[PDB]
Design a protein around this ligand. Structure first.
Ligand SMILES: NC(=O)c1ccc[n+]([C@@H]2O[C@H](COP(=O)([O-])OP(=O)(O)OC[C@H]3O[C@@H](n4cnc5c(N)ncnc54)[C@H](OP(=O)(O)O)[C@@H]3O)[C@@H](O)[C@H]2O)c1
Ligand code: NA
Ligand code: NA
Ligand code: NA
Lengths: 365, 365
């Protein structure tokens, strides 16, 4: 009655290609404490924050332990993932075998095959058999379940928790329009009847990307060259005037000249939220917007916001779940790599890191 | 019976050297409505906002009218000044002949010899005879009264209206430490028992400037080179550590690398207020301060803040007046040019614009 599991670990910080390895360890399913549960991993993605943890340049990080049976202290990898309950202890009533779960806290370590925890280390999601038996037209896919805990909540909370946009009338503007968060924000804008402008990098297949973002819910899509153009400012003013509303909110994950351009398109009393910085350039705002247009620039970090606010986390997650079940929200598809034991587990994640430019990478089990 | 007055006007926006002229006009002191008052100018300064109004790049400006008897609509110049009451109408009880007043609102037009207005177009200040009769050790000078409505209120409100610093413990930091507003903030910080760091440009007589700013009330003084040096950066953290407080507020009037440097020195949850800028330097903030340190950057514009808030303006002005009377506040000295009628009035102000880099220019009467 011993389960053999695999985990991706490191003994020292550095680049994933250099420091990651796979460790085998054992879990005893015949001797669970009353509140313990055992889970098997169904899938977990490679997110940028996971990589920064390994590099040692992220301010929140799991402790190095000898608990996986290593020769030296070693840390696990990954914060997001979808798990299935295999067995529960005698006092567990909130979970049963077959339930789908995600970690309730950060630093769980999701790049591995199995885990042992307490029942309150997890949040329950409905699995497809449960959604179907209760008459829902859809159930969660593995990719949808494995990525539900961050990017959908980021987009929802940025759009609803800070400024009240008037339906049909008001606008938000965002850069990184082809990012995962950007695509969730376009869909949520459409569902809540918010107008939006998406700014994106130009590309060889621009017409196809534009059509795809408008189908998700972007009202208009413009290139970074158009974002930089001062002669374009009157066209955008006329979009906003025709709707009878105002551009009240800007979402920035790029920085530099892109952040300047979307800040200039807000009406007076506008707010910018910076939630990423993929350009690695600082946020750059002209003095005149602060002084004469009452502009405010602030930050967003979902981990900090939800730290001591679990009603808000619960209520936001329930809404994302309901929209997936009703067929109203869709995920950006990941490139999936299945672990079948012929290739060491850490090499699949090393490939996921290296190929992240191709798109979101999900390792499945 | 009839007073002949002079006013500096323009019919079109542009550079003061090109568009200003002087217009003669008449005021009838025998025909006052019950609430009208006649005032005579004592002095009015040349501020940067006054020049930008004339240039057409400042969004708050007086309307062009034919009220001075011009062939075309014309606008007056200047927003602050000190006046003496000459005569009041039959229903005026708040003012009497000999009182000192400032305009109650912006866009009044202070580059002129005389004005006719309503009693509520003016705010009374005590004149030196009244301060002396009230037992105060000092009375206001003309320079103090003529410049009291902008720079002292800017410094006071930025320090008290936005974040609450704990007296004796907490810190603010500012750049442009030798500017007029910067020198007022050091003195007000000292009166409120706030600690402060002033960042200044390096200069030949640095030790003398540092001693002088510390005597005004700055706790520590550093150069821009030291602000940018991370080797120097551990010293600043220990200053704050030793005081048992936190750096909570940054005041920015420079932009660019300087704004980055003072932002990096705030503790978590800090606020930056931008109230001025340098030609081409946008405000530049690292992405990581927004996301991981809960940093917020906002603007300050005294004209907009006090637009519809006369209670706040009144209580702030009363405190600045009391501090001058009690000897607790000192002004920077202006270069004063007297109008005696041999040279047209608009030319005195044109010279004041051209020489503003020598120091604050005050035209007196
Ligand atoms: N603060 C928070 O709470 C929080 C939480 C989770 C994630 N995030 C942040 O949100 C961002 C997106 O995460 P994600 O999962 O959505 O990633 P993602 O889907 O893989 O997309 C990354 C985005 O960055 C853009 N990008 C990459 N390099 C760029 C450059 N040099 N200049 C401009 N744009 C560039 C990409 O655009 P192209 O398609 O044009 O290449 C893409 O839109 C990340 O910065 C992440 O750190 C923040
Ligand atoms: Na500017
Ligand atoms: Na100055
Ligand atoms: Na940064």
């Amino acid at each position: 009655h011993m389960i053999t599991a695999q985990a991706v670990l490191y003994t020292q910080h550095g680049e994933p290609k250099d420091v990651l390895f796979t460790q085998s360890f054992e879990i005893d399913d015949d001797n669970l404490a009353p509140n313990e549960v055992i889970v098997k991993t169904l899938g977990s993605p490679v997110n940028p924050s996971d990589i920064n943890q390994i590099q040692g340049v992220y301010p929140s990080k799991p402790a190095k332990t000898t608990g996986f049976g290593t020769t030296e202290p070693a840390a696990p990898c990954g914060n997001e993932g979808l798990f299935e309950v295999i067995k529960v202890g005698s006092n567990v009533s909130s979970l049963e075998a077959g339930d789908w779960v995600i970690p309730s806290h950060v630093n769980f370590g999701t790049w591995r095959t199995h885990a042992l925890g307490n029942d309150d280390d997890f949040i329950k999601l409905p699995n497809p058999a449960q959604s179907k038996a209760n008459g829902k037209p859809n159930g969660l896919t593995i990719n949808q379940g494995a990525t539900i805990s961050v990017n959908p909540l980021v987009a929802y909370l940025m759009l609803t928790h800070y400024v009240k946009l008037t339906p049909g009338k008001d606008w938000f503007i965002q850069n990184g329009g082809t990012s995962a968060v950007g695509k969730y924000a376009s869909q949520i804008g459409k569902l809540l009847n918010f107008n939006s402008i998406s700014v994106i990098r130009d590309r060889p297949n621009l017409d196809e990307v534009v059509a795809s973002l408008k189908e998700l819910g972007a009202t208009q899509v413009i290139t970074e060259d158009q974002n930089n153009s001062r002669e374009f400012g009157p066209t955008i003013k006329e979009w906003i005037k025709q709707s009878g509303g105002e551009a009240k909110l800007a979402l920035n994950c790029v920085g530099g000249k892109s952040s300047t351009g979307i800040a200039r398109k807000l009406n007076n009393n506008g707010l910018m939220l910076t939630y990423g910085g993929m350009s690695f350039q600082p946020v750059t705002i002209p003095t005149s917007l602060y002084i004469f247009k009452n502009f405010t620039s602030a930050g967003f970090w979902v981990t900090e916001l939800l730290k001591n606010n679990k009603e808000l986390k619960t209520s936001t997650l329930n809404q994302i779940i309901a929209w997936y079940e009703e067929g109203k929200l869709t995920d950006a598809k990941s490139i999936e790599t299945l672990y079948d034991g012929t290739k060491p587990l850490h090499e699949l994640y090393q490939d996921g890191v290296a190929n992240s430019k191709d798109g979101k990478q999900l390792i499945t089990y």
